[PDB]
Amino acid sequence: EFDVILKAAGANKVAVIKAVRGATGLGLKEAKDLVESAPAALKEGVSKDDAEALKKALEEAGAEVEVK
Amino acid sequence: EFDVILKAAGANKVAVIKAVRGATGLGLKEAKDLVESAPAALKEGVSKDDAEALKKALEEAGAEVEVK
């Protein structure tokens, strides 16, 4: 089981907030507070394939992410 | 499609944070910041059955929740 951590979004916050909402169903205020609060464990206990797909989706939106 | 909103957790925050992590996979810091930030849209675009099950799970943990 793996964890996906949002390490930083920097200048790509708009894009990253959009990607985090699509991946999690969080409301706008909530996703915005999580991205603005990085580092943050966004998803914990996901399978290897789920973690690698979320990692890639956040990387394409412009975030610095870690899978542990 | 429905939204599940955490309106307040009051004195039941510990329990509610646990329930929100089980339902979403959020890390501890993140779930704690969301519960402490209520009102918050926890899940948006879920089916009717998913919304009613999450509502019940948060109500049993001790939160004031709304389904819209």
Task: Annotate A41-64 with DSSP letters as a single string.
Answer: EEEEEE-HHHHHHHHHHHHHHT-E
Assess A68–B contact: CB distance below 8 Å, yes or no: no
Nearest to B25 by CA among A63, A54, A36: A54
- Domain with residue B26: its CATH number is 3.30.1390.10
The count of structural domains within chain A is 1
Q: What are the chain B neighbours of A42 within 8 Å (beta carbons)? A: 26-27, 30
Helices (H), chain B: 13-24, 28-36, 48-61
Q: What is the number of alpha carbons within 13 Å of residue B5 lying toward its C-beta?
A: 12
Residue A58's domain spans which residues? 1-68
B49, amino acid identity: D
Contact at CB, B40 and A34, closer than 8 angstroms = no
Method: X-ray
Residues B30 and A39 sit within 8 Å (Cβ to Cβ):
no
